């Protein structure tokens, strides 16, 4: 078996679904075996940033390994940022970068590309030894899985075709029987002894597909359940569904206190930081806080190493007597609906109504891909079937690329994208690849003519005023159907159309005025004053 | 006086002509000063890469300092690429990243693509640090990194000093010069190659004087292209390896006393490769050093080395200007035939011969660059070594900003334009009207010429011309050579809006230069 | 200030006392600045192994940084083993290896030397940037101190003289106020709740010179105190002196049980392994065991990170009410004495008697340097003033070299060395450097004509039979006074002489017969049968 | 040394490249015109054939070259120092070489020589031997 093949098969053997990428000198031989073998569908994008962003999503979507293939040099570096956000958000993107042969020895910078990716991945390896390649691949791949984060793989070209033995399974990671038990023991003990124990569900839960067993726990535990942002959605159809989502300040002040004022706050697979919605360590009692994350548990200031979340859970159940309990009790949830189909100018919230109404009228929910900006804060109030945005990273550019990658693996489902003018100027052009990719995602451009999120924080500043890019009129070039709307009528009307029109990506240019924000973005700002 | 203010001033004194950037939370406080103090012009773009390329171009244009202002995280990262290629081609792009408050890793990455960094978290030190970093950027001509905590943009600081002098081993300088000169005189067929550093440190005059006194054959590199063309001893052409003229390539590579003055060594297409020359008999002066076979003199800035040699060579009136080191393709037959690269070159060269003034040209990667190589220009900016796409458009933009009125020409392939091409939407607010000739062959042709069998090099039809409108510019698509000639003419007559010329080119049609390149890889 | 100088001064500023080493092509320029500056005394040895072994001891002796200077290539690699044992035993040896200039670019193996030392040190760095050198040095040096283990420093020759700014202080390491407190709390709580809490004193205690405060703790704690091997000696003149030393099986079965059967076994700065005397994790209740080591505390299966032993102690006192208590109570200790000055053949134990008697007669105790083999197990029963041997490492070769390095910094004191024939054949020749070094250590060769320690475990094997190297007769060549003894008379007599004769190293070749072992080595073997 | 280094078609058959004293340095030759066959490979200017064990390469070339009787044995590629003047002068390396070489010339059979690092090696180089083992590249004592 050829080396490059042995790899792709491996990726496949692990639930891979595609391989996004852009070729270059050194990467052609590998794209060749990628194409000729036909192992993994080869989708190619216009700019490397979208390459990584799509891989990110194709990974988050199916909760499996994403695949970003780039060429040596500018190709890799031009994608660094996409991998960073993927890393930042436990999105296991397997990066592959063709490198010079092992007999061409000289670089161009005073390795380097390696040290940069060494910086944003969990494991890396230069496949320069056909003998060691197999296990090495198994290792690194085994890492992105164990840790759910990006990995780096360099393949010198004169090695893309070296015969190698097939790639086996992931190397078995460390797990101590006793250690674990002791951990659960202390964890459960800590919970039982708490006043207001609050169990939070986050990202690691959706990555290791553990929702299945955590629902069986949320029940046998008996404590209140809340989700973080990355956790939003989880346990929706579970016996003891979350009582809401935590996004901090801009959120339901009711949920807030419950979390920030607990003494049994069990952060399951949760992320920790001061990234907007993330659970800031500054806003909680570090004393009584069990923090399960990255195969480790830390509460009481001490830590339990090599403790896979799966195991922690599995052993927590072994100590919790089964329960037939259930806290559902009617009441769904109230989203902003009712659009004034009049000719009054659009506002972020109006759009929400727009989509929501369509849905309540009977429309199946489309998963949403949102870029960073006022489009994100507006997407929170929309009924979905999975949301997908850079909340804990704020990496503009995501939006469109992400939605694309999504619909590329959706196996039919359609993807909805929301993005502002400022971000569309960055990656909104990746739609030109929608024809070749055979997908028709619906996009809602939030053209407010400025970097509005930045203006709210420094309105005296002019530089945040942008030009009026006639996007709707540009959608024809990339082969789509564009439509700029000024009023709520042209808005509701256009959307309906979009769902009817398939085969071509639908781009609805929403004309919004500066100042006009979203309810959720409103609350967020008001909350930074006091 | 604020800190930001002090940096901006410190920046302007060293040549700064503008500031390209894109804000974010941490950047905001910094940008407020920027915008207000108006020390430097604050030009915003759309995507970080552009900002990086633009800033890079700006610097090169005025052989001065460039300035890219980003925000912490996604912002800074999404711009690493431009800074790298900058580092590669010795362009001092001063990177300014806003960052977290000091009371409230990117740093570890940048250290890998800048010859100097610093985090100004102490106002008492800020003044000197700024003066140290920029210093290097100037001394080594490479990108530097400055990371500012938003809670220090206003902190008062002693004015920024002057650059801190660098080690100049006066004795080695004199000893090298002797070895160097002797090494030359004593060689069968010695040759002088003028490269990148000669431009960056504005040493054209000197090297022009030396070129004559040293009395040896002259040649430029790819980045050395266009230097000493008005000197008594002009280059015999430009060496770019197998690609170009085989008489110059043979001379360069066969020399037994090669003097790479401020050049770059690298197996990287046009860069003077170590596998092509006889390094044993090479005198490579670079990064303030000089090598030559089991010997490297350190601390010898190029500039002083010239002076050294000049002090060791008697004056001369030896002038040897002949005819055309390189025949520029002309005579565009405006018939109905489809279009081809070399035709674009003629179309372009003819206007010039017709009397038009040669513009400076900015090129992205792809055949557009090889094509630009057969065009008459007044400067040529392109990633000839780094070879990274995207540079084209934003670089032409960036150039024209500080080109005080002069118009810039930009050649970009379809593949590349899809990455940065849209930055043209800023032309309007930016007060620019650059001309763009987009090579739409509907494919990543440069690669197809390496794997014509693969089908992924097949791109769809992007009606770029139809999109020019939406960016406040005029964009026309042409298929024949007749249409090509007419449209190019209109562009030049139309100023006020950027002009986009989407020239449709068949897959398989390559520039002459590129043709030669591929054929040389078959051998 | 020159780079190489800036460094040596740094070492000095940190308590350095010398710089052992062997030069080579690439290392000459650095030895030149080492010599010319005269900052640190430059002692040179015959073979690299002794270079590292002496540095090891010069470090352990004064409990400070040792200094091993070698040349690139064979020089470094030929010393790898010495550094390993130093690392293995928390001996902060600062290794310095001159490297090719930054403009000579090509190696000879398919970096490498760097990766090998990366493997046996705690921090490393290639000083190739005069600007960054200072802080870098401070860093690495700061590491060997914080972690008390070997560090690697590579100095390209064209950099030995680059002007640099002086080297500042060590970079401040992480320390969490809360975390710490929480740790002590749980630690003390764990202790108080124990039945037979046993506090052990080990290596880290002597390295960070903490004995001063630990004695103040051993008192305020109130629990039994025992020392490990590396810990042997500590708290001797303390209010609550150790009740004995723990060396496992071969030790006082009385001490053994107390340790292996505790539920409050506080291993202070202790090492953990199955290395002869070390506290094997296989022989203790991991459940109730506080393990303070490498700036971390682990008990109850969880761990407290970035917890410097100093701090742990300092905060433990803050929670223990001062005490005037004391458990001294006469009884010193009984060592094997009384030598039968008859003409009966020598046995390991006889020699012990020999030295001991001399001491009780009034001789000040000499610190001892013992190699691995039956000489070590015999040295345990000798009255000393500090013992120094590879107990937790078993790296033969140590002996002599070590003793030499010692007396090189002893500031006058004399050093005693014990070593078997088999090890003397490895490094016993380093005595030839005793004249130039101006020291006269007394050495006791245990020539049993074989690798006796190995023979006891496989007596049916012949290969353990060695030849009769006439060492005593070889001592003249290296410029010493050699004397082979066959009987206990020639033994007692020779020793007395040796203490009288100064200026020349004294080598007493003790003729012992195969089979004849040491009491302590006896007990050890008998203990491997059952 | 001049011939080797000036060659415009150098064929290092199973050699080692390295700037390491006696090892054939890359800075001394014209690598562009070098054919270095090593570690089961063959290089030559922007080209490296992999998987070509030396042995087979020879055979290859032999299959491409007609037989020959071209013999060119001359005299002493290297004059071995002899004639040890056994006077009372102190001793010197080259003398040891003569002492050694003379016994051989006197008829004694050349032995194989093993040398450590130091001048002893350079000295062994002027001695008549039946094999010479020494660390000429690694240079470790
Ligand atoms: C890669 C990168 N570069 C810059 C920034 C900085 C930023 C954070 S928010 C924002 C404004 C976004 O404008 P948009 O039209 O998309 O939506 P809206 O604000 O409602 O007008 C910027 C520029 C980030 N986060 N990432
Ligand atoms: C950031 C980056 N990613 C990939 C590549 C690799 C590449 C080198 S050449 C080429 C094809 C360019 O197509 P284009 O339309 O621009 O011009 P042409 O080939 O003549 O049709 C690619 C993808 C580079 N150099 N930089
Ligand atoms: C560097 C190294 N190489 C080999 C060995 C293996 C060994 C462990 S014990 C022993 C015998 C030592 O004989 P010695 O004369 O010194 O004393 P004695 O046993 O009483 O006769 C050997 C060879 C070790 N530990 N280290
Ligand atoms: Mg907007
Ligand atoms: Mg193209
Ligand atoms: Mg022995």
From Swiss-Prot, chain B:
PANTHER family linked:
PYRUVATE DECARBOXYLASE (PTHR43452), PYRUVATE DECARBOXYLASE ISOZYME 1-RELATED (PTHR43452:SF30)
Gene3D superfamilies with a match to the protein in the record: 3.40.50.970, TPP-binding domain
EC number in record: 4.1.1.74
Q: Which NCBIfam families match?
A: indol_phenyl_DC
The UniProt catalytic activity note for this protein reads: indole-3-pyruvate + H(+) = indole-3-acetaldehyde + CO2
Q: Which Pfam families match?
A: TPP_enzyme_C, TPP_enzyme_M, TPP_enzyme_N
Provide the binding site for Mg(2+). 414, 441
Q: Which organism is it from?
A: Azospirillum brasilense
Print the organism lineage: Bacteria, Pseudomonadati, Pseudomonadota, Alphaproteobacteria, Rhodospirillales
Its recorded name reads Indole-3-pyruvate decarboxylase
Curated annotation (Swiss-Prot), chain D:
What family is this protein classified in? Belongs to the TPP enzyme family.
Q: What is this protein called?
A: Indole-3-pyruvate decarboxylase
Q: Which top-level group of life is the source organism from?
A: Bacteria
Q: What is the lineage of its organism?
A: Bacteria, Pseudomonadati, Pseudomonadota, Alphaproteobacteria, Rhodospirillales
Portion of the full sequence shown:
264 to 404 of 545
- Whichever gene encodes this chain, its name is ipdC
């Amino acid at each position: 078996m050829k080396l490059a093949e042995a790899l792709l098969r491996a990726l496949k053997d692990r639930g891979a679904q595609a391989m996004f990428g852009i070729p270059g000198d050194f990467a052609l031989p590998f794209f060749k075996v990628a194409e000729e073998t036909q192992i993994l569908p080869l989708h190619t994008l216009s700019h490397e940033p979208a390459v990584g962003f799509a891989a990110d999503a194709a990974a988050r979507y199916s909760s499996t390994l994403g695949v970003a293939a780039v060429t040596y040099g500018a190709g890799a570096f031009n994608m660094v940022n996409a991998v960073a956000g993927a890393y930042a958000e436990k999105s296991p993107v397997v990066v592959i970068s063709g490198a010079p042969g092992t007999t061409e020895g000289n670089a161009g910078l005073l390795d380097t590309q390696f040290q940069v990716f060494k910086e944003i991945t969990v494991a890396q390896a230069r496949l320069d030894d056909p003998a060691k390649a197999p296990a090495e691949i198994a290792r690194v791949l085994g890492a992105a899985r164990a840790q759910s984060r990006p990995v780096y793989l360099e393949i010198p070209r004169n090695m893309v075709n070296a015969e190698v033995e097939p790639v086996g399974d992931d190397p078995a990671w460390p797990v101590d029987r006793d250690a674990l038990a002791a951990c659960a023991d202390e964890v459960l003990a800590a919970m039982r002894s708490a006043t207001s124990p609050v169990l939070m569900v986050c990202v690691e839960v959706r990555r290791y597909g553990l929702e299945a067993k955590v629902a069986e726990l949320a029940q046998r535990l008996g404590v209140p359940v809340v989700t973080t942002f990355m956790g939003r959605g989880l346990l929706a159809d579970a016996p003891t569904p979350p009582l809401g989502t935590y996004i901090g300040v801009a959120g339901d002040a009711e949920i807030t206190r419950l979390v920030e004022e607990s003494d049994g706050l069990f952060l399951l697979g949760a992320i920790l930081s001061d990234t907007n919605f993330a659970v800031s360590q500054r806003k909680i009692d570090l004393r009584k806080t069990i923090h399960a994350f990255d195969r480790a548990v830390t509460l009481g200031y001490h830590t339990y190493a090599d403790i896979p979340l799966a195991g922690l859970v599995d052993a927590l159940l072994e100590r919790l007597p089964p329960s037939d309990r259930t806290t559902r009790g009617k009441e769904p949830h109230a989203y902003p609906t009712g659009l004034q189909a009049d000719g009054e100018p659009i506002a972020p919230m109006d759009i929400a109504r727009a989509v929501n109404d369509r849905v309540r009228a009977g429309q199946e929910p489309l998963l949403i891909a949102a870029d960073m900006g006022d489009c994100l804060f507006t997407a929170m109030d929309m009924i979905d079937a999975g949301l997908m945005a850079p909340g804990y990273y704020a990496g503009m550019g995501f939006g469109v690329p992400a939605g694309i990658g999504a619909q590329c693996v959706s196996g039919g489902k359609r993807i909805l994208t929301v993005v502002g003018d400022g971000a569309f100027q960055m990656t909104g052009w990746e739609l030109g690849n929608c024809r070749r990719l055979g997908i028709d995602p619906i996009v809602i451009l939030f053209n407010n003519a400025s970097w509005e999120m930045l203006r709210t924080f420094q309105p005296e500043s002019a530089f945040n005023d942008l030009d009026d890019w006639r996007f709707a009129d540009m959608a024809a070039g990339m082969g789509g159907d564009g439509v700029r709307v000024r009023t709520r009528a042209e808005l509701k009307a256009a959307l309906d159309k979009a769902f009817a029109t398939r085969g071509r990506f639908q781009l609805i240019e929403a004309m919004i005025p500066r100042g006009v924000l979203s309810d959720t973005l409103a609350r967020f700002v008001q909350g930074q004053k006091r």
